[PDB]
Structures are given as structure tokens and as C-alpha cells.
Design an enzyme around this catalytic site. Structure first.
Site, mmCIF file in Angstrom:
data_model
loop_
_atom_site.group_PDB
_atom_site.id
_atom_site.type_symbol
_atom_site.label_atom_id
_atom_site.label_comp_id
_atom_site.label_asym_id
_atom_site.label_seq_id
_atom_site.Cartn_x
_atom_site.Cartn_y
_atom_site.Cartn_z
ATOM 1 N N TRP A 149 -13.587 6.114 4.004
ATOM 2 C CA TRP A 149 -13.500 4.663 3.888
ATOM 3 C C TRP A 149 -12.916 4.056 5.155
ATOM 4 O O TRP A 149 -13.353 2.991 5.604
ATOM 5 C CB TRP A 149 -12.658 4.285 2.668
ATOM 6 C CG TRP A 149 -12.167 2.868 2.683
ATOM 7 C CD1 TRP A 149 -10.954 2.425 3.128
ATOM 8 C CD2 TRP A 149 -12.875 1.707 2.231
ATOM 9 N NE1 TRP A 149 -10.864 1.062 2.982
ATOM 10 C CE2 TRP A 149 -12.030 0.597 2.433
ATOM 11 C CE3 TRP A 149 -14.141 1.498 1.675
ATOM 12 C CZ2 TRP A 149 -12.410 -0.702 2.100
ATOM 13 C CZ3 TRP A 149 -14.515 0.208 1.345
ATOM 14 C CH2 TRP A 149 -13.653 -0.874 1.559
ATOM 15 N N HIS B 179 -21.255 -26.113 -13.670
ATOM 16 C CA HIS B 179 -21.475 -24.701 -13.969
ATOM 17 C C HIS B 179 -21.284 -24.424 -15.453
ATOM 18 O O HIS B 179 -22.167 -23.864 -16.111
ATOM 19 C CB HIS B 179 -20.539 -23.819 -13.142
ATOM 20 C CG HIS B 179 -20.751 -22.351 -13.358
ATOM 21 N ND1 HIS B 179 -19.882 -21.392 -12.884
ATOM 22 C CD2 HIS B 179 -21.729 -21.679 -14.011
ATOM 23 C CE1 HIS B 179 -20.317 -20.194 -13.233
ATOM 24 N NE2 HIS B 179 -21.433 -20.341 -13.925
ATOM 25 N N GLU B 180 -20.140 -24.831 -16.004
ATOM 26 C CA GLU B 180 -19.854 -24.551 -17.406
ATOM 27 C C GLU B 180 -20.846 -25.254 -18.321
ATOM 28 O O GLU B 180 -21.240 -24.708 -19.357
ATOM 29 C CB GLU B 180 -18.419 -24.958 -17.736
ATOM 30 C CG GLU B 180 -17.372 -24.059 -17.097
ATOM 31 C CD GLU B 180 -17.633 -22.586 -17.342
ATOM 32 O OE1 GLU B 180 -17.880 -22.209 -18.508
ATOM 33 O OE2 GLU B 180 -17.592 -21.803 -16.370
ATOM 34 N N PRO C 160 -11.966 -21.658 -16.544
ATOM 35 C CA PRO C 160 -13.161 -22.094 -17.276
ATOM 36 C C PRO C 160 -13.922 -20.898 -17.827
ATOM 37 O O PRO C 160 -14.137 -19.903 -17.131
ATOM 38 C CB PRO C 160 -13.973 -22.851 -16.216
ATOM 39 C CG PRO C 160 -12.982 -23.216 -15.158
ATOM 40 C CD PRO C 160 -11.974 -22.112 -15.144
ATOM 41 N N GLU D 165 -25.536 -15.241 -14.406
ATOM 42 C CA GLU D 165 -24.526 -15.775 -13.505
ATOM 43 C C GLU D 165 -25.122 -16.482 -12.297
ATOM 44 O O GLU D 165 -24.386 -17.161 -11.573
ATOM 45 C CB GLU D 165 -23.591 -14.656 -13.033
ATOM 46 C CG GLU D 165 -22.272 -14.598 -13.784
ATOM 47 C CD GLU D 165 -21.209 -15.482 -13.161
ATOM 48 O OE1 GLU D 165 -21.389 -15.903 -11.998
ATOM 49 O OE2 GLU D 165 -20.194 -15.759 -13.834
ATOM 50 N N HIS E 161 -9.581 -4.762 -11.000
ATOM 51 C CA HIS E 161 -10.897 -4.537 -11.589
ATOM 52 C C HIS E 161 -11.332 -3.080 -11.485
ATOM 53 O O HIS E 161 -12.132 -2.618 -12.306
ATOM 54 C CB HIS E 161 -11.927 -5.448 -10.921
ATOM 55 C CG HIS E 161 -11.610 -6.906 -11.039
ATOM 56 N ND1 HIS E 161 -10.709 -7.541 -10.211
ATOM 57 C CD2 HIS E 161 -12.071 -7.853 -11.888
ATOM 58 C CE1 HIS E 161 -10.630 -8.817 -10.545
ATOM 59 N NE2 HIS E 161 -11.447 -9.032 -11.560
ATOM 60 N N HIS F 38 -24.436 -23.320 -17.226
ATOM 61 C CA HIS F 38 -24.516 -21.896 -17.532
ATOM 62 C C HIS F 38 -24.530 -21.652 -19.037
ATOM 63 O O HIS F 38 -25.093 -20.652 -19.497
ATOM 64 C CB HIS F 38 -23.362 -21.160 -16.844
ATOM 65 C CG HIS F 38 -23.156 -19.755 -17.313
ATOM 66 N ND1 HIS F 38 -22.342 -19.439 -18.377
ATOM 67 C CD2 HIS F 38 -23.653 -18.581 -16.857
ATOM 68 C CE1 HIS F 38 -22.348 -18.131 -18.561
ATOM 69 N NE2 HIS F 38 -23.137 -17.587 -17.652
ATOM 70 N N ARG G 9 -11.960 -10.574 0.294
ATOM 71 C CA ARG G 9 -12.982 -11.284 -0.467
ATOM 72 C C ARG G 9 -12.853 -12.797 -0.322
ATOM 73 O O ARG G 9 -13.866 -13.503 -0.266
ATOM 74 C CB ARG G 9 -12.908 -10.881 -1.940
ATOM 75 C CG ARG G 9 -14.094 -11.335 -2.774
ATOM 76 C CD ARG G 9 -13.913 -10.956 -4.235
ATOM 77 N NE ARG G 9 -14.934 -11.556 -5.087
ATOM 78 C CZ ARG G 9 -14.896 -11.560 -6.412
ATOM 79 N NH1 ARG G 9 -13.899 -11.000 -7.077
ATOM 80 N NH2 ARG G 9 -15.884 -12.141 -7.088
ATOM 81 N N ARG H 10 0.815 -1.209 0.000
ATOM 82 C CA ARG H 10 0.000 0.000 0.000
ATOM 83 C C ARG H 10 0.851 1.262 0.000
ATOM 84 O O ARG H 10 0.384 2.316 -0.448
ATOM 85 C CB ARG H 10 -0.960 -0.009 1.187
ATOM 86 C CG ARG H 10 -2.316 -0.595 0.837
ATOM 87 C CD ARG H 10 -2.723 -1.674 1.813
ATOM 88 N NE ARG H 10 -4.059 -2.185 1.536
ATOM 89 C CZ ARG H 10 -4.318 -3.206 0.731
ATOM 90 N NH1 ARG H 10 -3.349 -3.853 0.103
ATOM 91 N NH2 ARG H 10 -5.578 -3.588 0.551
HETATM 92 ZN ZN ZN Z 1 -21.862 -19.885 -16.155
#
Ligand code: ZN
Length: 597
Positions: free
Chosen positions: A459, A356-357, A328, A384, A487, A360, A255, A151
Site C-alpha cells: 500500500w 436529493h431526499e 438526512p 444512489e 467502515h 431519491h 476523501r 496511527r
Molecule cells: Zn437518495
């Protein structure tokens, strides 16, 4: 009479004819890049994407003289509304050029984040040297130095560009007749002209905050339990009622906390459900997973992947010297051509990602009959969330018992079930208050409630009371904590995860109600119920032809956000937890802080 719509239909037909081939060879070229990265491949992706973007921009211009009030059909209005958007070109040339050159800056230097170890003999980067340090560790000093070193460096150079980016995004927002950047992002849930099946831009903020209130008792119980577990880890720097320091937040952003499993296991003598050896004793390959998966889909009516999957798609990384992306991925190339890529392995996590693959992508097959501009999901979260609820049934003990992955006499204990709750909570649910309140922070940042001179210090300021996380060392205005996430620089929305989570729980509850399963929601199984698949098809067929408001009601029965299924799903945990606060203080004590006193 020559109604404008009769020429806009021909224009849309020409657009569809051009764009289908454009994206099809672009996606065909796109596949050749993921499976083969070379100097020639990147160039033709750049050319194809530039041509596609230019064509889309010309069609956006051509959509302008045909107005939106000349179309009465809501579905047709949606196509023109999507096409009419131009982007950042609405302002003057100089501001647009400065936008493009600023975006280039956040692309090049931003990806080159570096940290400096106190000892020169070891040098580690974010991937994967640092990630091991924050996540896979059992000490304090290593996490502290990693946090300080990372940081300390990235904030100074990256802070100034954020304000210019925000004000420029606001200026383009005003250029498109929107009030602010918030209204620019709040326009994705606005429904007008449908009638009572509508949604308000500000209703999403109000309803989500309301749903947060019902979470608070269970969140406090769980946080207190995990804290009482955590005092055995850092007794000398954390008070039994104090907040977790930002350098003991599990990872870089808080996360992902998965690697901390050994430290916080409630019952260490009870093993988790892991049958990895059993398929290795039954010679189960990745291919066999795909056909036993079909057995669940035929029970609900869903077919298998097309024949192009069997030959064109590869189920493993090629070993001819070519390096690929092993993440994936879900590909909808169009024109009936579908290809599927992952470096899958024989593991339970890969066992779930395979479904999932497979599942989805099945959403693409559901709305594949819709027009090319309507070949999408209801919104960002529906697509999703459809995939994740599929693997929910594939992880049920009954499904594995009937699939041969479990012994016919296998019995599961309620203590064994305890691990599955904590695991999936820690994966998906545990960040829901965090995600909601981070998006609250951004919304007041977008709304202007937070003054410009305290954008980063609030924050940390509200972190003391509201977020319940204490900073280890205060930092001045030059530092930018969000700059630690890749991101952020690429303008990635964060409400998508929350909407996906809520929609996935609503879908699971609706399917279980259709399946007529009795008892707590976690024992639900929807296999072999052919009547439950016809109801699912009613929502799958619509795709983007109908708004999410009404599409959600087709499967659930209600057109509003609901956390009662969440409370029902966590009901046993609540009943087992309410007594725990008799001998422990509730909440986080703001009186004691590690940094000042
Ligand atoms: Zn998917």
C-alpha cells in the site's frame, strides 16, 4: 402435474404476507428509534431485527429444496436466488461462533479510538476535535502530530484480526461454491440466461481500468495545476515535483478536502454563487422548498410526496428534549407509509440535500408497484445515482433565475463558473482515480497478487510510483492504516461510489440528450420538458424487474461503461489546461523523496 413452481409460488406468497407486516412494524419501530432513543426503544429494535433475521434464515432454508433450474423466468429466478442465500452458517459451528465473537470485538473497542496530544492541557477525539485538526488547519506540525499519534496506536491491536476475517470470509466464499472472496463480491454483476444483454464478472475490472486510461491526461493536468498552487503552502517540505505527504492529504483518508477552500482558490476576488440572504429576504422556509421542487417534478411527470409526508414527517429537529440523528435519511416503510427525516436548514447544501431526499425517495414510488421482493433499484449504484442527478438541475443558474433565487437581470461570468467546476470535482470527481486504485489494491489483495507478508507495505510501496503519495515515516508490519476507517470493520463495499458516479454521469448525459440541449454539457437544463419525463418514466417503472445492463440502455442508448460524456463535460477545462504544462513538469517525480534523502 404439480410443478415445483406452483408450490414455490404459494411459499413466496406466504413469505410476502409475513415479511410485509414484519418489516412494516419493524420499520415503524425503526422510525421511533431514530426520533426517540431510549432504553425501551433499543430493546424492541433488537427483538424485531432478531425475529426478522431468524424468519429470513428459515425461509432461506425452505428455499433450498426448490432448485433454481425449475424456474425458467429470469425475474422469478432472481427472487429465489436472493432468498436462497444463507450466509456464514455453511461452515462448522466453531468457526461461525468465532466469526460472531470476532465481529463483536470490532464493534466495541474499535469505536473507542483515541489520540494523545503532546500537551496534556488539550485533549481531542476523532469527533470533532481531531477532524478540525486534519481538515480545518493551515499548519504542518498539528497535522503531523495528529497523523503520528493516531496511527501509532490503532494499528497494533487491530492488525491481527484482519487476516483471520479475510481467511474466514474466503472459507464461507468456498462454502457457497465460489472461487474466492473476489468471486463472492463479483457475483453482483453476473447475468446468465438473458442472452446478449449480459455482463461478465471480470469485465467490470477490465473496463474500469480502460476508462482510467482516458482520465490520465486530464488528471495529470489538474494535479499539476493544484500542485503549482500548493507549493505556496509547504515550500520547506515538498518539492515542486514531489508527492504530497500522507499527513497533508486533506483529512484522515483523503476523501474530503472541502475545508481547504481558502488556500487553493484560483480567483479569490470573485465570489461564489451564494444567495443565502435572498430567501431570507423573501421569507422562504423549508416547506416552500418542497413545493417549488415539485414544479420541476411535474415538468417530468413526477408527483409530490404522499399526504403522510405533510403530517407525519418532521422537517426539523424536535425541541422537546429528545435527541435524534440529524443525517438526512431515505425511508421506505412499505404499505403505502412513507416518512422522511432531516434537520434541514436554509442553506444551499441543505437546499440540494432536500431535493436529493425528495427525489431519491421518488425512486421508491416508481417501483412501488413491483412485488415486495422486487421493490428495489436496479443495483447499488442506480438508486444512489438517481438522487444526485436531481440536484444537478436544481443548481443550474437558469433554474434559480426562474425560481426567484436569482435576479431577473443576473449575469454569470465564466470566471464565476470556474468555482463550480472545482467545487463539484473536489466533492465527487477528484477521488475517482483514488477510489478506483484503492479498489484495485483491494482486488489484488482479494486475488492474492499481493503477498501476504507485504499486505500493508505495498500500500505504501506502490504509493511512491503509482499513487504518487509519499509516506512521512515508514511503519512495520504491525500497523493497519485501513483500521482508521470505521467502515472497514463493518464490511462496506467501495465500488458502490464509483458505480454511482459513472451511472449518475451517464444519466445526466442521457437526460440532456433527451432534452436536446446544445453546447457544453454543464449548461444543460431539463426543466419544463414534458417529453423528457416520459423517457425517464420508462426507466423508473422497471425498477428491479430488469437488469441494469438493459435498464441503462433504456435511458442512455448503450449497454457499456462510457466516459465520453465525462470528457465532453470537462472539454473546456482540458482546452484551457493543455497549454499549462509548457513551464511545469508532468506527473510526480519519483526520484526525489522526502523520507530517504
Ligand atoms: Zn437518495
Amino acid at each position: 402435474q404439480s410443478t415445483t413452481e406452483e408450490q414455490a409460488k404459494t411459499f413466496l406468497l406466504k413469505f410476502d404476507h409475513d415479511a410485509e407486516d414484519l418489516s412494516y412494524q419493524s420499520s415503524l419501530a425503526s422510525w421511533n428509534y431514530n426520533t426517540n432513543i431510549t432504553d425501551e426503544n433499543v430493546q424492541k429494535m433488537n427483538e424485531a431485527r432478531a425475529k426478522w433475521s431468524a424468519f429470513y434464515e428459515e425461509q432461506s432454508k425452505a428455499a433450498k429444496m426448490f432448485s433454481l433450474e425449475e424456474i425458467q423466468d429470469l425475474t422469478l429466478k432472481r427472487q429465489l436466488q436472493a432468498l436462497q442465500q444463507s450466509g456464514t452458517s455453511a461452515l462448522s459451528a466453531d468457526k461461525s461462533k468465532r466469526l460472531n465473537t470476532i465481529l463483536n470485538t470490532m464493534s466495541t473497542i474499535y469505536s473507542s479510538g483515541k489520540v494523545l496530544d503532546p500537551n496534556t492541557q488539550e485533549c481531542l477525539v476523532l469527533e470533532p476535535g481531531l477532524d478540525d485538526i486534519m481538515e480545518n488547519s493551515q499548519d504542518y506540525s498539528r497535522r503531523l502530530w495528529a497523523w503520528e499519534g493516531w496511527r501509532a496506536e490503532v494499528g497494533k491491536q487491530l492488525r491481527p484480526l484482519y487476516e483471520e476475517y479475510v481467511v474466514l470470509e474466503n472459507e464461507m466464499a468456498r462454502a457457497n461454491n465460489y472461487e474466492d472472496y473476489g468471486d463472492y463480491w463479483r457475483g453482483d454483476y453476473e447475468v446468465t440466461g438473458a442472452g446478449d444483454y449480459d455482463y461478465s464478472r471480470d469485465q467490470l475490472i477490465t473496463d474500469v481500468e480502460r476508462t482510467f486510461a482516458e482520465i490520465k491526461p486530464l488528471y495529470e493536468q489538474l494535479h499539476a495545476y493544484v500542485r503549482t498552487k500548493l507549493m505556496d503552502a509547504y515550500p520547506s517540505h515538498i518539492s515542486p515535483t514531489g508527492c504530497l505527504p500522507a499527513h497533508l492529504l486533506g483529512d484522515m483518508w483523503g476523501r474530503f478536502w472541502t475545508n481547504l477552500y481558502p488556500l487553493t482558490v484560483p480567483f479569490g476576488q470573485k465570489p461564489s454563487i451564494d444567495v443565502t440572504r435572498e430567501m431570507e429576504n423573501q421569507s422562504w422556509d423549508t416547506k416552500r422548498i418542497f413545493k417549488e421542487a415539485e414544479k420541476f417534478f411535474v415538468s417530468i411527470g413526477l408527483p409530490n410526496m404522499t399526504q403522510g409526508f405533510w403530517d407525519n414527517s418532521m422537517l426539523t429537529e424536535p425541541g422537546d428534549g429528545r435527541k435524534v440523528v440529524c443525517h438526512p435519511t431515505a425511508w421506505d416503510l412499505g404499505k403505502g407509509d412513507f416518512r422522511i427525516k432531516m434537520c434541514t436548514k436554509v442553506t444551499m447544501d441543505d437546499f440540494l440535500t432536500a431535493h436529493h431526499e425528495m427525489g431519491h425517495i421518488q425512486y421508491d414510488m416508481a417501483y412501488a408497484t413491483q412485488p415486495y421482493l422486487l421493490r428495489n433499484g436496479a443495483n447499488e449504484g442506480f438508486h444512489e445515482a438517481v438522487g444526485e442527478i436531481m440536484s444537478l438541475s436544481a443548481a443550474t443558474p437558469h433554474y434559480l433565475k426562474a425560481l426567484g433565487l436569482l435576479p431577473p437581470d443576473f449575469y454569470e461570468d465564466s470566471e464565476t463558473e470556474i468555482n463550480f467546476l472545482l467545487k463539484q470535482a473536489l466533492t465527487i470527481v477528484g477521488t475517482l482515480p483514488f477510489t478506483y486504485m484503492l479498489e484495485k489494491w483491494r482486488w489484488m489483495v482479494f486475488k492474492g497478487k499481493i503477498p501476504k507478508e507485504q499486505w500493508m507495505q505495498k500500500w505504501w510501496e506502490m504509493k511512491r510510483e503509482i499513487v504518487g503519495v509519499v509516506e512521512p515515516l515508514p511503519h512495520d508490519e504491525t500497523y493497519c492504516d485501513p483500521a482508521c476507517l470505521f467502515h472497514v470493520a463493518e464490511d462496506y463495499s467501495f465500488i458502490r461510489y464509483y458505480t454511482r458516479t459513472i451511472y449518475q454521469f451517464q444519466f445526466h448525459e442521457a437526460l440532456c440528450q433527451t432534452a436536446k440541449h446544445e453546447g457544453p454539457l454543464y449548461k444543460c437544463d431539463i426543466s419544463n420538458s414534458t417529453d423528457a419525463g416520459q423517457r425517464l418514466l420508462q426507466m423508473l417503472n422497471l425498477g428491479k424487474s430488469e437488469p441494469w445492463t438493459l435498464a441503462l440502455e433504456r435511458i442512455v442508448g448503450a449497454k457499456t461503461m462510457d466516459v465520453k460524456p465525462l470528457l465532453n463535460y470537462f472539454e473546456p477545462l482540458l482546452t484551457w489546461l493543455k497549454d499549462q504544462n509548457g513551464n511545469s513538469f508532468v506527473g510526480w517525480s519519483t526520484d526525489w523523496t522526502p523520507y530517504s534523502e
